[PDB]
Amino acid sequence: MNIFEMLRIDEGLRLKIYKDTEGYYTIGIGYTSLNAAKSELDKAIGRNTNGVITKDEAEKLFNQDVDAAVRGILRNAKLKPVYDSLDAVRRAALINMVFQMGETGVAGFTNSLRMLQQKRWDEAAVNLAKSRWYNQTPNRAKRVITTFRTGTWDAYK
């Protein structure tokens, strides 16, 4: 088990485009005007695909984003610190975080972070949990949260 498998348990998977509730249209794995959408897939993958891609192209994308989540962590002065003090399992749940909402958005949880360095696990499991984040996605919110609190992937098996 690795971060990748994680987000794949977390983002479903689409071979065709999907408009969703806010107007976001997503494809492949955790990926973000329907024409403006199949006018970026055209640029992302490398071609015209009418909204459809293969699992390869879907995942190549995955790979793209993920590596990005990584970097957005280190370009940040607020995250890299908390990162370095986290272990593999805890660090990845952070990566599952940035992936989802991005560095800046996570950059908002200062309390929750200071709590994640002192290793106040529990407190950071209850702070993160009372959020617009959590309320909208309690299923994955909870998984990545358990992860932050235990130091194990028993939220993924």
Curated annotation (Swiss-Prot):
Where in the cell does this protein reside?
A: Host cytoplasm
Q: Where does substrate bind?
A: 99, 112, 127
The UniProt-reported impact of residue 11 to N is: Loss of 84% of enzymatic activity
- Show the InterPro entries listed in the entry: Endolysin_T4_type (IPR034690), Glyco_hydro_24 (IPR002196), Lysozyme-like_dom_sf (IPR023346), Lysozyme_dom_sf (IPR023347), Phage_lysozyme-like (IPR052619), T4-type_lysozyme (IPR001165)
Consequence the record notes for mutating residue 20 to E/Q: Loss of 99% of enzymatic activity
Entry keyword annotation includes Hydrolase: yes
Q: Does the keyword Protein transport apply?
A: no
Outline the inducing conditions. Answer: Expressed late in the viral replication.
Question: Which CDD domains does the entry link to?
Answer: T4-like_lys
Keywords tagged on the record: Antimicrobial, Bacteriolytic enzyme, Cytolysis, Glycosidase, Host cell lysis by virus, Host cytoplasm, Hydrolase, Viral release from host cell
For this chain's UniProt record, which GO biological process terms are given? cell wall macromolecule catabolic process; defense response to bacterium; peptidoglycan catabolic process; viral release from host cell by cytolysis
Q: Which Gene3D superfamilies match?
A: 1.10.530.40
Recorded protein name is: Endolysin
What is the species of this protein?
A: Enterobacteria phage T4
**Upper lineage ranks?**
Viruses, Duplodnaviria, Heunggongvirae, Uroviricota, Caudoviricetes
